[PDB]
């Protein structure tokens, strides 16, 4: 029962609350699983060698697929600003980190194709990325003595690019695992 | 639908194949300047597996 400013009397009403649970199989199969399959490929770019000439293809494809699926989700949910779907947040964060991976990939490809005729390797770069980081990353370079200076520096640039890829392969895997668990695990616990 | 289930199964397999192809490409572009081949890799992948798969590395050298 309640009073309305229209009228001086009390007007009763009966309000029915329909608590309805969605059966998630259809949208599971059609949205969630494809999104997870695409998410499985987000870090693969950092294990592709720079000589394959296909890093850009892979990372761009992942970015565009994630964007398309975000757009598909947007057409289903209401355009309300009070709550954000967890699927939407996950897709947006994955898109952000895939964009970051594309930027890093461009940088790594640029580093790979450097030669003495165009670039000079600083001593600090040589020290760090040929002695320290490879040791911390458990990768051991063979001890090879190339006599040709131009062909040896080109191989050092190619190895520096591999190390930078491996660093970000580790960080993105940690972020991918921590982010996914840090987003979906707590809700599933109550 | 069974067609949908089959398509989903094939999509999972193709994702598996993408991961495996990335790994294969990583292996293919390896050289002595950057990687050293462990003797177990040598044995397994150059003698045992090829014999099982009927490949017979020519090994002329």
Contact status, residue A41 vs residue A62, Cβ threshold 8 Å: yes
Is the Cβ pair A49, B23 closer than 8 Å? no
CA distance between the termini of chain A: 35
C-alpha distances in Å from residue A22, one per residue of A3, A101, A162, B42, B47: 36, 36, 47, 55, 56
Encoding tokens for residue A114?
A: 């450097």
Experimental method reported for this structure: cryo-EM
Encoding tokens for residue B59?
A: 């090994």
CA atoms of A154 and A145, how far apart (whole Å): 13
Is the Cβ pair A142, B35 closer than 8 Å? yes
CA atoms of B50 and B44, how far apart (whole Å): 9
Q: Output the 3-class SS for A49-115.
A: CHHHCCHHHHHHHHHHHHHHHHHHHHCCCCCCCCCCCHHHHHHHHHHHHHHHHHHHHHHHHHHHCCC
Beta bridge partners, A2, equal A11
CA atoms of A122 and A130, how far apart (whole Å): 12
CA atoms of A92 and A79, how far apart (whole Å): 16
Tell me phi and psi for residue A85, to 5 degrees: -60, 145
Is the Cβ pair A49, B4 closer than 8 Å? no
Which H/E stretch holds residue B52? helix B49-53
Is the Cβ pair A142, B12 closer than 8 Å? no
Within an 8 Å CB–CB cutoff, is residue A141 touching chain B?
A: yes
Expressed as residue numbers, the domain containing A64 is 24-188
Which residues does B contribute to its contact with A (CB < 8 Å)? 4, 8, 11-12, 15, 18-19, 22-23, 25-26, 28-29, 32-36
Burial A109-127 (b: 16+ CB within 10 A, else e): eebbebeeeeeeeeeeeee
The SS3 of residue A2 is: strand
The SS3 of residue A137 is: coil
CA proximity to A28, closest of B14, B18, B5, B10: B5
Is the Cβ pair A52, B25 closer than 8 Å? yes
Q: What is the resolution of this structure in A?
A: 2.3
Which H/E stretch holds residue B39? helix B39-43
């Amino acid at each position: 029962t309640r009073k309305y400013e229209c009228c001086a009397e009390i007007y009763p009403d009966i309000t029915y609350a329909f608590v309805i649970r969605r059966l998630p199989l259809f949208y599971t199969i059609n949205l969630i699983i494809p999104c997870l399959l695409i998410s499985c490929l987000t870090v693969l770019v950092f294990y592709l060698p720079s000589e394959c000439g296909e890093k850009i293809t892979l990372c761009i494809s992942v970015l565009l697929s994630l964007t398309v699926f975000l757009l598909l989700i947007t057409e289903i949910i209401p355009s309300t600003s009070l709550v954000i779907p967890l699927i939407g947040e996950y897709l947006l964060f994955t898109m952000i980190f895939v964009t970051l991976s594309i930027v890093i990939t461009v940088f790594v490809l640029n580093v790979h194709h450097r030669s003495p005729r165009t670039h000079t390797m600083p001593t600090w770069v040589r020290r760090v990325f040929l002695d320290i980081v490879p040791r911390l990353l458990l990768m051991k370079r063979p001890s090879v003595v190339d006599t040709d200076f131009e062909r040896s520096v080109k191989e050092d640039w190619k190895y520096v690019a591999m190390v930078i890829d491996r660093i970000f392969l580790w960080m993105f895997i940690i972020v991918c695992l921590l982010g996914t668990v840090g987003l979906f695990l707590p809700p599933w616990l109550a | 639908p069974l067609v949908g289930k089959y398509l989903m199964f094939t999509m999972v397999l193709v994702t598996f194949s993408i991961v495996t192809s990335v790994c294969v490409l990583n292996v293919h572009h390896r050289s002595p300047t950057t990687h050293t081949m462990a003797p177990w890799v040598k044995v397994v992948f150059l003698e045992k597996l090829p014999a099982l798969l009927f490949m017979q590395q020519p090994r002329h050298h």
